Amino acid sequence: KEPTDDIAEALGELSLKKKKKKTKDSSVDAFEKELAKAGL
Amino acid sequence: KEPTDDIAEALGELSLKKKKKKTKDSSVDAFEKELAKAGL
Amino acid sequence: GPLGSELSRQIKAAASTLEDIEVKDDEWAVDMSEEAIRARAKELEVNSELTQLDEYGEWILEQAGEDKENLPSDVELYKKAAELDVLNDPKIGCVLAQCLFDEDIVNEIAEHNAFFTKILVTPEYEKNFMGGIERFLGLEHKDLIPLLPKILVQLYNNDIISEEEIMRFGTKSSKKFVPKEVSKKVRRAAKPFITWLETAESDD
Amino acid sequence: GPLGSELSRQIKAAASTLEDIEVKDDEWAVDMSEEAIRARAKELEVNSELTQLDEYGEWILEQAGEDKENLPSDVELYKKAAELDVLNDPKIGCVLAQCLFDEDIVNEIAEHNAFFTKILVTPEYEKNFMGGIERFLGLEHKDLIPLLPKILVQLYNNDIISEEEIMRFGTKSSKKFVPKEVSKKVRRAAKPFITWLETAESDD
Amino acid sequence: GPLGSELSRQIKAAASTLEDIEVKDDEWAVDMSEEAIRARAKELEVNSELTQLDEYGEWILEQAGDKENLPSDVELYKKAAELDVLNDPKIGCVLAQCLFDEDIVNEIAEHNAFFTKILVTPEYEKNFMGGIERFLGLEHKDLIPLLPKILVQLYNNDIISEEEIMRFGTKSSKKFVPKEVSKKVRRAAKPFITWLETAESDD
Amino acid sequence: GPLGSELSRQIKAAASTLEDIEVKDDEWAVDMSEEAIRARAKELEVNSELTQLDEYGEWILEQAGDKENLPSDVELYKKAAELDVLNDPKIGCVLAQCLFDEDIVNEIAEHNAFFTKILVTPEYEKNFMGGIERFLGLEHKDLIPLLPKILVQLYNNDIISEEEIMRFGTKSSKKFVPKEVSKKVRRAAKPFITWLETAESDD
């Protein structure tokens, strides 16, 4: 009888819900701001 | 420190004393007699 | 013997070819033959880009150590990539996938979203990253293969890797990153997630 | 990679040659190719004498079992040799040396004096017997190599093997019975006795 | 050096293994270990189990040379009875590997009564199909494209049962051919197998 | 089959090892394991340690092509100073492997002042002798018979110390040549070495 912890956690997280494109593009903005502070 | 039993026994037995050729030829005679009893 | 004259000769020649390679490799530093000098010169031109990727991986490992909680900041990871001129190399994803994570990969893979969007410029970068994950789990840490379904959920939900590249990793045999047997094992460990995705895409 | 195109091709060809041998060997019993049929026919003619020696060794092992105290009588050992027509084969000494003894070899090697005098007709038989001892200690029972000085005392004192053949075994490299590294190890384990013999012969 | 420790250790291990095989082969004739005796005895036993089958095969190949000069079906049967191979299910393996050439699609339907008389059990049919898998998969890979046609003849002439044709096309053997060859042969057969599966479903 | 279980297991192990080496080589450019990085880094470090020595050697081989066209001793020294190799004891290894050809018995005595000026420590002499061991033992085995004559020139012209000639002839290296080559070279040198041992004993 094999452990089920790894598969069960994945099975429970399964969801078509995805990160919003705008949310992805927004996190990009803070990072680009940190990059600009470094001259890049 | 390696065991010495095998080498020591050999070292103790070392001797130029050898089986007499006649003794070797004599043991041969009993064997040949056993062979003759078997037809060989 | 059972081999026969021809196969015995073939086996002996193979052994001698291999023994010669070992001697040449072991004595390379004292080898001043025209062959060795020319070879050392060629290795520098041919492996220039590889040396730059190696230096990035080495720095990542040296800075973080065994624990990936000491990893340099995403800004620092990007700056070093630029300094070594590896930003324009799709294999940077292969380096990152093999050097940024440890046993806490499920949590770690979702802690660099903006960095991955900026670094993984084209699907080719995403493919190289997935190849690196294949090597990390299939060759270097076979004990973590059970985490692949969870790893894939983090990649899909956070939009780190495209559905198309996740599907290629899970359904296609690429001999570029891992041996065919390793590929088969990784795709099997991924099948639970891939089946869900194929069905979700079929449902549209 | 580090191998280069030529060595990579040579290694891949060797692997494929080896993989083909494995397939041919594994499927021999269902192989009705002209090659396999002809090969099976040739193995019968080429290995006729070897089959006879094998049958003698098999019988010795089957009759005695693990313990060599159940060994058939010397008269029985000779009769079977004649029955299998292996008396005229110098390799009978090689068979006897590898099948007649166990861990009690020091005692056992001196229990068949008349038999050995009758069976080991020429120095070539004695050489084959010594080759068999080399295989028994150097390849099959490396744990018994420490007994070689004692084994040699029994051979010399009982006049089972000539001084000349004992000296060749101890001082010459024969690639016929064992690999060069195994030969070196057996001659080293024999050196204590051989040194004594060389000195005794020098003293005359 | 250029190899690195891992690749160097592996190249050294490969060389040692290859040297070990060379010595085992070089010393086979003086190797009287229980393992060497058992090995030579086991091959002798297999060789002996195959004596009559080998004689049958060699006679077929010698008499034929072009399989048009193949001995007659009557002569093939008489020779089988003389060599006592009729009661051996492996006769199918011999026939499949010795009776055919590049004209197999036609030749495989020119011996109907012979095959009906000799392939008396499903085991004989399985052995025949294994022989075909070897003939095409190993000895004549150029003829693998002919498999759907070959199967059509075997099914139409009632030479091989549908149950056995399905096993050949759906089951992986290790007995007659390597897994790679089984996969290739089963793929080349898929066009006919698919049809047979539908017919079985319809009926 | 004919092989027996042991030989079959070994042939299978050899094939697997060889396949593993092929994959390691095929995947080297995407292998970012610590071991692959360490290996490539270690070779880069060795390559870098040899940059000036390699440049010196290549210049010698290019300028010479026939070693009669070898650059002059003055040019050899000036180039060494320009490439900063004079302070590197391995310059002896480069010179021994690049300055000589089939006429070595004579050429090895045509650079006396050069060698006296450059071989400043016993370590330089050891490196020169290692280079000769490679030149004869690995690259020109046909010239091994010339070793006693070569050693006579080296001893007579005070190019190499007797202590270092004795080490070359009596000590087994693993650094410059494989053990088999060291044994062959030391045997070809025995005629001169024996003489040197007696002279040392007499004095």
From Swiss-Prot, chains A, B:
Disulfide bridge positions per record: none
Residues recorded with modification Phosphoserine: S15, S27
Subcellular location: Cytoplasm, Cytosol
Modified residues (Phosphothreonine): T4
Subunit structure: Eukaryotic translation initiation factor 2 eIF2 is a heterotrimeric complex composed of an alpha, a beta and a gamma subunit. The factors eIF-1, eIF-2, eIF-3, TIF5/eIF-5 and methionyl-tRNAi form a multifactor complex (MFC) that may bind to the 40S ribosome. Interacts with GCD6. Interacts with GCD1. Interacts with TIF5/eIF-5. Interacts with CDC123.
Reported function: Component of the eIF2 complex that functions in the early steps of protein synthesis by forming a ternary complex with GTP and initiator tRNA. This complex binds to a 40S ribosomal subunit, followed by mRNA binding to form a 43S pre-initiation complex (43S PIC). Junction of the 60S ribosomal subunit to form the 80S initiation complex is preceded by hydrolysis of the GTP bound to eIF2 and release of an eIF2-GDP binary complex. In order for eIF2 to recycle and catalyze another round of initiation, the GDP bound to eIF2 must exchange with GTP by way of a reaction catalyzed by eIF2B.
Annotated family: Belongs to the eIF-2-beta/eIF-5 family.
The protein's name: Eukaryotic translation initiation factor 2 subunit beta
Lineage: Eukaryota, Fungi, Dikarya, Ascomycota, Saccharomycotina
Gene name in the database record: SUI3
Portion of the parent chain present: 66 to 105 of 285
From Swiss-Prot, chains E, F:
Keywords: GTP-binding, Initiation factor, Nucleotide-binding, Phosphoprotein, Protein biosynthesis
Function: Catalyzes the hydrolysis of GTP bound to the 40S ribosomal initiation complex (40S.mRNA.Met-tRNA[F].eIF-2.GTP) with the subsequent joining of a 60S ribosomal subunit resulting in the release of eIF-2 and the guanine nucleotide. The subsequent joining of a 60S ribosomal subunit results in the formation of a functional 80S initiation complex (80S.mRNA.Met-tRNA[F]). eIF-5 is essential for cell viability.
GO MF annotations, alphabetized: eukaryotic initiation factor eIF2 binding; GDP-dissociation inhibitor activity; GTP binding; GTPase activator activity; translation initiation factor activity; translation initiation factor binding
The protein's name: Eukaryotic translation initiation factor 5
This protein's record includes keyword Endoplasmic reticulum: no
Gene Ontology cellular-component terms listed: cytosol; eukaryotic 48S preinitiation complex; multi-eIF complex
Quaternary organization: Monomer. The factors eIF-1, eIF-2, eIF-3, TIF5/eIF-5 and methionyl-tRNAi form a multifactor complex (MFC) that may bind to the 40S ribosome. TIF32, NIP1 and TIF5/eIF-5 comprise a minimal 40S-ribosome-binding unit. Interacts with NIP1. Interacts with SUI3.
Modified residues (Phosphoserine): S33, S201
Domain W2, residue spans: 46-203
One GO term of the biological process aspect: regulation of translational initiation
Family indicated by similarity: Belongs to the eIF-2-beta/eIF-5 family.
Gene: TIF5
Modified-residue entries (Phosphothreonine), positions: T121
Miscellaneous: Present with 48300 molecules/cell in log phase SD medium.
Species per Swiss-Prot/TrEMBL record: Saccharomyces cerevisiae (strain ATCC 204508 / S288c) (Baker's yeast)
